[PDB]
Design a protein around this nucleic acid. Structure first.
Ligand SMILES: *[C@@]1(O)[C@@H](COP(=O)(O)OP(=O)(O)OP(=O)(O)O)O[C@@H](n2cnc3c(=O)[nH]c(N)nc32)[C@@H]1O
Ligand SMILES: [Mg+2]
Ligand SMILES: [Zn+2]
Ligand SMILES: [Zn+2]
Ligand SMILES: [Zn+2]
Ligand SMILES: [Zn+2]
Lengths: 49, 55, 1097, 46, 50, 65
RNA sequence: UGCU
């Protein structure tokens, strides 16, 4: 019940559209949430060190 | 090339809202169907720039 | 001895429309906002300074908006027309300039003209280029003279700011609570803060609730805290009635239970009950003085007015606790309409405050630590902040004002260019504050307060029924006044000061309270004299004619309203059973000696508000005038709106019929304006041979719809023929359709952009790829010209390119990939014009105008100006169409079975009037509550030799024998709608799918398939077609084969299970792709579905 | 190849090449339309 | 300014005084037309200032 | 936009009488007697000529020219 | 935003 590992799903659940008209792409919210989680883990590790 | 006749006359001809890369000699369907997004799917994909995604 | 009636009384409406009416409201509001309100906002925020480095300041002197200009040229301004802005997809705005003075290094430096932003200029405004122009100049500028205007043009799209309808502020509302507790509420809103405070009787005692208090406290404690500590004085202020004391006794007992008897103790208790944002006593006093009841002012911590206000509120609550005299929210007398001017003023104030804060922050960051070089604001004065803010707020339509905590959506909408009537009706729409929150049916219902203000019948049919409304033909919206002379006259008329006497006088039956914009103005006796004198003074002119005065006897309150947004309507003053306006005055107005302003000044016509007409008596006609009459109705047909004004004889039809007729006229097909050829929109519908109606209304003549009609008059015969008109359908004539009847033109726009990226590279148009075998362009590039752009005059087929665009992939040699603009269309289209423009960003905008000439066929929808919408069922030839003695064959044959259930006698009256008019060479009038009578048209018919009932002897065309019953022939004004079967036809093959879920797309434009919703699944289940349901929902929609491991129950790939690192127990299985996605999402959510497979046997 | 266009207000035949600022002589209007084609087009009277 | 399709429809609605008995029906196709079953009417109008 | 050549119901040639009707309007003839003198007995052609709006000149005022 |  207490989680220590998060299961990032495949790319089929996280569709990415390459918008060549600008310098950016359309990404779902799950990718951003996982990126924020990884950033927070790195920040916690840095603070611990 | 065509898997049946080996010809390189592969043309992308949409037949009634159906994208299809088909040989122009024998009509052998090489590939068919394309995966697009849908509008609600398009709306829920958020715009993130390379300035943040690249690093 | 009948009362004389002025026949020319209707001439007062055109004179009123000459200066006010439909579109003048937004024009005047925008003019006021850009002339006075912007200057007031600039004066309020004239001085801005930073805390660090004192003696530094930035002082604003005067702000200008200037004339509309375009920043296309290289640092050069140039006048630009609205049509040019629409063509170039830019904004029609003017450069905002200001003169300022600042101190760079303690030396005062002034600037006489400095741009700070760009304000989108409304069309036909004071500073617009269209105003004060003749039709010749409109033609020179490529603009329609009949265009209503009043809308903004941003990035080429036309947006209209709808009128918002909200509740009146600073007003006590007594209503039942959630559980059913009759309480009161008051939302005090000042220029800075807006606080809603309530009072409940949940436990027989009055508890006051505010957002800044931890728990609701008794009202007696607040009384003791606000200065008045004597329980006797509190009771006298509440009321002297036996039931009032009996109801207030519990509150006194609860207060006496505690040890709160002084102002200090009450303030200490309040401070203890105050939430975090003697110090507690000071905070409690500050909240009581400023936060609670902000609209009630205190001179210097003198809570006498606030005490009287809360006492009157408690008295009203006590009175309502008995007889169920609960006030209703749907009463429009307590509604306020915020035009675009107020919204733009608030937005500009917020943006200016944000700009001032940003400038102060930049100064605080730059001045102290930059260098000895003295810093000045000019180097950081952002000139794009206000421009971008205005553009976003007008385009996106979402307004987020943090200073006021206002988050509104749908403020601006795309102006519907379906027809001139559509645009004119959409310009005068009103949106509500509810915005489809609950199906209350209260505000959605038609209230009697909408008399003469809003159109009762005009309402969109659908989910927005009752929330979207249109203004009446004759109405006005008031603005804000100074309120100075009003207070002066009230004080001079003997209104006693509320602070001079105690609250016991409020309980007397003859003492009437007087309120001013929610604030207690005082008390008065014999309010009849006060009201009469105030009305006489307003008629004389010393008081603004828009200041409303109303009297409610149930509460004994006289309200004096002077705030803006109130709805008013002109009425003729009636004195002693005779109106002030006479035939001599009407003749003078017709000859031009006087005008509507002269009528207003001579105490002949006056503006009445909803609250004022609630007490005043009005007469519909002269014969209805009795002894107890104060005003006379100008015209009854003005009750209907613009869209409803097109209905001929609407008082002979049903209300849903009129609603459907307005809804379909909002989509009717016809000409837009005299510049419709030069106009290039994403979708336009035009009619080949439009004809003005034979039965035209006075509203039609006023709105000049006859100059831009949206339909044709056809000889319609009401009968049943061939059984192809069973349910609302109609039969068209093949010969009539061949001779040009109903011919329509569909104009579509295809836009392409060739922009330059960051790198020194640009998108380029490649020439036509000529085939070396035949030395001619290929079938796809056949319509392209030498420059790769399709030339006008040719026909475009399906899957053909219009612009052979190629763009680089780098952003060493550039690598261009082709992205041509292919034409997706079932039918062919002809290119009319190809416009090429260049923006300031070196971007080439190419717009090709595609045209499609379509003929009425089976499936096309048609309307008959009476809500009798129908679909073309069959097209029989002329020889099959019946013929009369004269040889006239009907173009349209409608079903007579639709008349009994719908009671559309107005359609028959319109047909008879049109027949009489086409016979006698006249135009009959179908004015509401009037118009040409049936006797006149019957006399015309009998004089011209036709039957006096429309029915004529007709011979069958098929069998050649006469019919046993006469057919009802006559000209009816039929209008074609934009709903075309060619556009609504859809057929989906396998086609593409969605990336996330492998299922067909949604919309038809993106090649989407139909959806077998939950109801369809339920129907299939009820039928029991298990195999059919399976084939529909699994095989033909999201069929897929996955690999599942029989050991762990997880999903594998390519016959391999990575979990067990084995492939012996892995087997294939059919499963919907949606189900597989659900399983994957559950596995991600840690809810692991373990599938235990087994043999099908 | 001489590419010809028409001004929005002058209605004069102006010749410009590729990658040029869209402008018309003796004026400053920036709306340039393309002349109608010279190819034969067949229409039906139906 | 009049649309090409509207102009063609108006021209088609214009009657011709030619005797139909002296002509025949055009066969399926044959857009070029033959002398027996076709009639050509030229219309060239160039408007200019007086 | 422009007066149709043929009448929707019957099909009598009516486009050639538009200028004659305009001339009658410029004269003292009313709508009724002008339509009677033009030879329109049946009411369909009377409606066609009377309910028609002249917008061709309004569009030509905006034409490139 | 429109349509039944
Ligand atoms: C309309 O004025 C507003 C109102 O739309 P909402 O229903 O508030 O949009 P929503 O709440 O977000 O609905 P949903 O959750 O289903 O997506 O919005 C514009 N508008 C909304 N929906 C449409 C639409 O489907 N088609 C068009 N043309 N406009 C729409 C309207 O301006
Ligand atoms: Mg229906
Ligand atoms: Zn092949
Ligand atoms: Zn396994
Ligand atoms: Zn020019
Ligand atoms: Zn006719």
């Amino acid at each position: 019940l207490i989680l220590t590992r998060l299961l990032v799903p495949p790319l089929c659940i996280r569709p990415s559209v390459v918008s060549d008209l600008k310098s950016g792409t359309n990404e779902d919210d799950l990718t951003m949430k996982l990126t924020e989680i990884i950033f927070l883990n790195d920040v916690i590790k840095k603070h611990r060190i | 090339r065509c898997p049946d006749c080996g010809s390189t006359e592969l043309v992308e001809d949409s037949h009634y809202s159906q994208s299809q890369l088909v040989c122009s000699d024998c009509g052998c369907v090489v590939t068919e169907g394309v995966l697009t997004t849908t509008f609600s799917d398009e709306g829920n994909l958020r715009e993130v720039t390379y300035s943040r995604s690249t690093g | 001895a009948p009362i004389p009636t002025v026949e020319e009384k209707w001439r007062l409406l055109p004179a009123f429309l000459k200066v006010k009416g439909l579109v003048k409201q937004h024009i005047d509001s925008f003019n006021y906002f850009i002339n006075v309100e912007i200057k007031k906002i600039m004066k309020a925020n004239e001085k801005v300074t930073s805390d660090a480095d004192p003696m530094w300041y930035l002082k604003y002197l005067n702000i200008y908006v200037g004339l509309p200009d375009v920043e296309e040229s290289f640092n050069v301004t140039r006048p630009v027309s609205p049509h040019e802005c629409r063509l170039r997809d830019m904004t029609y705005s003017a450069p905002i300039t200001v003169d300022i003075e600042y101190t760079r290094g303690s030396q005062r430096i002034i600037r006489n003209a400095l741009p700070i932003g760009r304000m989108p200029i409304m069309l036909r405004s004071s500073n617009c280029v269209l105003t004060g122009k003749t039709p010749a100049e409109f033609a020179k500028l490529n603009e329609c003279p009949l265009d209503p205007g009043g809308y903004f043009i941003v990035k080429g799209v036309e947006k209209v700011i709808l009128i918002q309808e909200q509740l009146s502020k600073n007003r006590i509302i007594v209503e039942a609570d959630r559980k059913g507790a009759v309480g009161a509420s008051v939302t005090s809103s000042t220029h800075e803060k807006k606080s809603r405070t309530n009072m409940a009787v949940k436990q027989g005692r009055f508890y006051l609730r505010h957002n800044t208090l931890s728990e609701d406290i008794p009202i007696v404690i607040i009384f003791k805290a606000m200065g008045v500590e004597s329980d006797q004085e509190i009771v006298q202020m509440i009321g002297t009635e036996e039931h009032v004391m009996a109801a207030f006794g519990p509150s006194l007992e609860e207060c006496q239970k505690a040890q709160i008897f002084t102002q200090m103790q009450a303030l200490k208790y309040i401070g203890n009950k105050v939430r975090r944002q003697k110090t507690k006593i000071e905070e409690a006093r500050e909240l009581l003085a400023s936060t609670i009841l902000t609209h009630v002012p205190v001179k210097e911590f003198n809570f006498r007015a606030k005490c009287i206000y809360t006492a009157v509120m408690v008295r009203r609550v006590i009175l309502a606790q008995g007889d169920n005299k609960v006030d209703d929210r749907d009463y429009y007398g307590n509604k306020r309409l915020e035009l675009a001017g107020q919204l733009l003023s608030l937005l500009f104030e917020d943006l200016f405050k944000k700009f001032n804060s940003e400038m102060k922050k930049i100064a605080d960051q730059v001045i102290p630590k930059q260098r000895a070089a003295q810093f000045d604001v000019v180097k950081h004065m952002r000139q794009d902040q206000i421009t971008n803010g205005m553009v976003n707020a007008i385009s996106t339509g979402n307004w987020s004002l943090k200073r006021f905590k206002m988050d509104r959506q749908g403020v601006t909408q795309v102006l519907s260019r379906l027809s001139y009537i559509s645009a004119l009706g959409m310009m005068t729409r009103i949106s509500s504050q509810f915005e489809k929150t609950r199906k209350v049916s209260g505000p959605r219902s038609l209230q009697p307060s909408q008399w003469g203000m809003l159109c009762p019948s005009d309402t969109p049919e659908g989910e927005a029924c009752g929330l979207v409304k249109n203004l009446a033909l004759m109405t006005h919206i008031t603005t804000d006044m100074e309120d100075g002379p009003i207070v002066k006259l009230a004080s001079n008329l003997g209104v006693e000061d509320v602070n001079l006497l105690c609250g016991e006088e409020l309980s007397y039956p003859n003492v009437f309270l007087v309120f001013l914009n929610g604030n207690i103005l005082g008390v008065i006796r014999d309010h009849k004299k006060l009201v009469n004198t105030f009305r006489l003074m307003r008629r004389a002119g010393y008081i603004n004619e828009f200041v409303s005065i109303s009297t409610n006897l149930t509460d004994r309150c006289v309200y004096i309203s002077s705030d803006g947004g109130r709805l008013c309507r002109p009425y003729i003053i009636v004195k002693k059973q005779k109106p002030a306006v006479t035939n001599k005055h009407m003749e003078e107005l017709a000859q031009g000696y006087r005008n509507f302003e002269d009528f207003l000044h001579e105490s002949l016509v006056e503006y009445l508000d909803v609250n004022e007409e609630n007490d005043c008596n009005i007469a519909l006609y002269e014969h209805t005038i009795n002894k107890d009459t104060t005003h006379l109705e100008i015209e009854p047909f003005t009750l209907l709106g613009v869209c409803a004004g097109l209905i001929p004889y609407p008082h002979h039809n049903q209300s849903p019929r009129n609603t459907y007729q307005c809804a379909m006229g909002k989509q009717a097909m016809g000409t837009i304006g005299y510049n419709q050829r030069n106009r290039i929109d994403t979708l336009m519908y035009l009619l080949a041979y439009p004809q003005k109606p034979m039965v035209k209304t006075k509203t039609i003549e006023l709105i000049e719809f006859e100059k831009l009609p949206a339909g044709q008059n056809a000889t319609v015969a009401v009968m049943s023929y061939s059984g192809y008109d069973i349910e609302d359908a109609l039969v068209l004539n093949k010969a009539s359709l061949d001779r040009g009847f109903g011919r329509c033109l569909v104009y579509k726009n295809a836009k392409c952009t060739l922009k330059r990226y960051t790198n020194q590279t640009f998108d380029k148009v490649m020439g036509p790829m000529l085939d070396a075998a035949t030395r001619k362009p290929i079938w796809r590039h056949e319509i392209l010209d030498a420059d790769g752009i399709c030339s006008p005059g040719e026909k475009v087929e399906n899957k053909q390119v219009l612009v052979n665009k190629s763009m680089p992939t780098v952003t060493q040699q550039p690598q261009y990939k082709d992205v041509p603009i292919t034409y997706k269309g079932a039918t062919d289209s002809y290119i009319e014009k190809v416009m090429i423009s260049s923006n300031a960003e070196d971007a080439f905008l190419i717009k090709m105008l595609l045209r499609q000439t379509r003929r009425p066929e089976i499936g096309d929808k048609f309307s008959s100006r009476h809500g009798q919408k129908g679909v073309c069922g069959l097209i029989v030839p002329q020889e099959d169409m019946p013929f009369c003695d004269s040889g006239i064959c009907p173009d349209i044959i409608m079903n007579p079975h639709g008349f009994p259930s719908r009671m559309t006698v107005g359609k028959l009256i319109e047909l008879l009037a049109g027949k009489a008019g086409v016979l006698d060479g006249r135009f009959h009038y179908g004015t509401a509550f009037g118009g040409s009578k049936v006797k006149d048209v019957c006399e015309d018919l009998v004089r011209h030799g036709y039957n006096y009932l429309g029915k004529d002897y007709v011979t069958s065309g098929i069998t050649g024998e006469p019919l046993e019953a006469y057919i009802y022939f006559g000209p009816v004004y039929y209008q074609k709608l934009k709903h075309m079967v060619l556009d609504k036809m859809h057929a989906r093959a396998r086609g593409p799918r969605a990336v996330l879920t492998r299922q067909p797309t949604e919309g038809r434009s993106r090649d989407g398939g139909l959806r077998l919703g939950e109801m369809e699944r339920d129907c299939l289940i009820g039928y029991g077609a298990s195999m059919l349901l399976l084939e529909r929902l699994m095989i033909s929609s999201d069929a897929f084969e996955v690999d599942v491991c029989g050991q762990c129950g997880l999903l594998g790939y390519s016959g391999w299970c990575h979990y067990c690192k084995s492939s012996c127990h892995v087997s294939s299985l059919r499963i919907p792709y949606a189900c597989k996605l659900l399983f994957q999402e559950l596995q991600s959510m840690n809810i692991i579905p373990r599938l235990k497979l087994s043999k099908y046997n | 190849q001489p590419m010809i266009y028409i001004c929005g207000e002058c209605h004069t035949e102006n010749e410009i090449k590729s990658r040029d600022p869209i402008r018309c002589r003796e004026c400053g209007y920036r709306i340039m339309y393309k002349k109608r084609t010279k190819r034969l087009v067949v229409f039906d009277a139906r | 300014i009049v649309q090409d399709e509207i102009l063609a429809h108006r021209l088609g609605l214009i009657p011709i005084h030619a005797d139909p008995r002296l002509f025949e029906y055009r066969n399926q196709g044959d857009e070029e037309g033959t002398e027996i079953d076709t009639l050509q009417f030229r219309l060239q109008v160039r408007c200019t200032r007086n | 936009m422009i007066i149709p050549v043929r009448c929707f119901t019957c099909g009598k040639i009516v486009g050639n009488k538009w200028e004659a009707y305009l001339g009658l309007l410029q004269a003292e003839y009313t709508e009724g007697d002008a339509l009677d003198a033009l030879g329109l007995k049946r009411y369909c052609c009377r409606r066609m000529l009377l309910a028609h709006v002249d917008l061709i000149e309004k569009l030509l005022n905006y034409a490139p020219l």
